[PDB]
Structures are given as structure tokens and as C-alpha cells.
Amino acid sequence: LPMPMRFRHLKKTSKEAVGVYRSPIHGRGLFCKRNIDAGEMVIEYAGIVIRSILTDKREKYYDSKGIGCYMFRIDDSEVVDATMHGNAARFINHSCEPNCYSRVINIDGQKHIVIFAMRKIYRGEELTYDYKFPIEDKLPCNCGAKKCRKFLN
Amino acid sequence: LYRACLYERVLLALHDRAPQLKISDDRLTVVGEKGYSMVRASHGVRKGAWYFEITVDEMPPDTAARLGWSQPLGNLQAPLGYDKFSYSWRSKKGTKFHQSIGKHYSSGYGQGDVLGFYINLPEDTETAKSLPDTYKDKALIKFKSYLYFEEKDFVDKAEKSLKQTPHSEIIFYKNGVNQGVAYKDIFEGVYFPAISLYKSCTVSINFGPCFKYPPKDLTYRPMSDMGWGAVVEHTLADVLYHVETEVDGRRSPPWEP
Q: Among B21, B33, B75, B77, which would you mutate to test the A interface (most chain A Cβ atoms within 10 Å of its Cβ)?
């Protein structure tokens, strides 16, 4: 099916496909409300599409406001910043064993970061993907996976 | 191989523009859509004094171009003066912008300004006081349907000490009328004329032989002259690199020139 048609279908079904609940991973997180097949569109990380050069000026801005940064790198040139304006995708925890995966798609010239399902996800499951955060010097992970790196970084 | 440039004259190099930067070769004007961006010319100055112009063809209120010079390391997505290696003017009121700092040590700007840009950097002696060797990198690639060359550029300099190039300066003119000195403190490293666009700004760079209010100095050089100078210099660079790798030995005359 066409990536535009699939994206329209995803934006139509997103509000009733997933939910946010109290999470045993941490705080609140994204849970599955209807069995999601593999590779299908789970959710867009929708937000403010900005250029990369403006990230820091925003980040420091949030650093001046004590508001956490909700930014995902679209590519070397664009970023979806969801700190001030976003969607439910801001509540997707991470797991070392993800049933989901992030991919950038091009619809009518604009890039969309869509989390798709790495596998057939069933109702009730908490949605998690690989943030692929670079190794820092340390955030402990509680994803519960047996392969868990003990640290995102 | 060769560094042959897809240009009839020394123009704004397409190799050093942002993907959000549009050009119209009817006037070689440059325009953008969102925020600011930066483009540069084909040539680049290393010594001597020279001069060019920018002609503005459209400046709505939400349209503010910036015009000036910038060394390499200049991120072409930034508004030409956001870093310490770029010095420009904001085309709302004549205001010198460098290190993102705005200074009103300047005249006033007009919507239909044909602005002249004079700039004098010292010889490579006072620039380097050492060897200005130009050992070049050359890598062959075949992008989707055409052949191209890659070279290694300079790295972000952490220079925080002020060592101005001796007797270097920048002067700004409005239609030849002296708008005054913009920056006397000029850091080392080659510079090139650059243009920053805000949302839908229409401006264009222009060389000397078709000028409107040119200075009558016998030492300053138009854009085209330094352009073919640098082109021939890089031709000799290719010559010397292929010599080095291909034939044993090298030799150059009494160093001074």
C-alpha cells in the first residue's frame, strides 16, 4: 500500500489503536489496545519539524525553563521537537528487545518519523523501541529484557 | 582528473549551499523559504585587497537578508555571523553582525540598495608568517549519475585568542558612498563573500566589470579576477599533486611570490 495511503490510515487509527497507562517500566507509557501486526504503522512521533541548527537554541531554552527536551533526529538536517507540541508518541518507553522500530518516511516531500512494529504486537502490550542512544559516561534501564544492556548508553 | 568548475564566470558556488537555498541564474539571485541560510561565491580571498557588490531585488518587512564575508567552518545553515568566523551586515538597518552580536557602528540600509563591499587582507606573510603550503586532498566518487571530487575541509577552530591579521580591514559602501569601516579585527584563514537569506529574501552578488559605482583603485581586484586566480591556482595544485605521486622530485622558485 502507498506510504501516503498507509500514513493516512495510521493517522486515522492512531487515536484508537494505542493508549497510555501506568507502566511497570517507568511511570506512564504507551500500551497496545488492538493487536498490531508486524511492520505496520504503530504511531507517528508527531511534533514540531525544525532544522538541526535550531536544536541547541531550543534545548538551552528548555534548559533555561527546566522543561525536558522531547526531540528526535529526523536526519542530519531536521528534527521533530515534541517538547512543547507533540502527540502520545512522547510516552514510548525503550526496551533492549523492541517489538517496534523507528523509520523515517517521505510523504509529499516532508519527513515523518513513524514507529512501526518489529513484530505482531498484541493488545495490552507496552510499546517500546530502540532509542539507539549513544554511549555516555549512564542511564540504568529497567526494560525487563534478558538481553538488556543495563544501560541505554 | 581536474577541478573544472561549472561556471561561465565566478559565481555563487552551488557546491556550498544549503538544501533549503534556491537560486535564479536570471540574476543569480538567492532565495529561501524557512528561517535563515547561507550561500557563498565560487572564489575565496587569501591576500590583497578586493571588492564586490550585492544588489537587492526584494525586501519585504518579514524579509531581511544579511551580506558579508565568512571563512570556511561557516555552517551554511546559520545566518552569516552566528559564529566568530563570519562578519556580515543585516539588511533592515545597517548593523554589523558577528558572533551573532549586532553592532550599530554602521550607516542605514535601504530597500533598493546596491551595496559595495571592500575588504583588504594582508599578504600570506602576515597571514601565516610561515609556510602557506596547499597540499590538497582529492578523492574520486561517482554519485548517482555523475562524477565528483571530495576533499578534506578545515575543522571547527577553538580559537579564543585575538590575533588580528595585520592591517586587514573591511569597508562598506552604499552605492559607492562610504558607509564606513565594518570590521578592523580580522582573524586568519581564507574568507569568501557570503549571503544569508531570511524567509524569501532576494539578493545577488556581482563582480566588477559591470559595476555601477566602482572605486578607482589600481590595487583592488573584482570578483572575476580573484576567481580565475584561484581557479588557476587549484589547476596548479592538481598539477603538483599528480607530479608528487607520479614523478619523483619537486622544486619551486625563490620563495617570495
A: B77
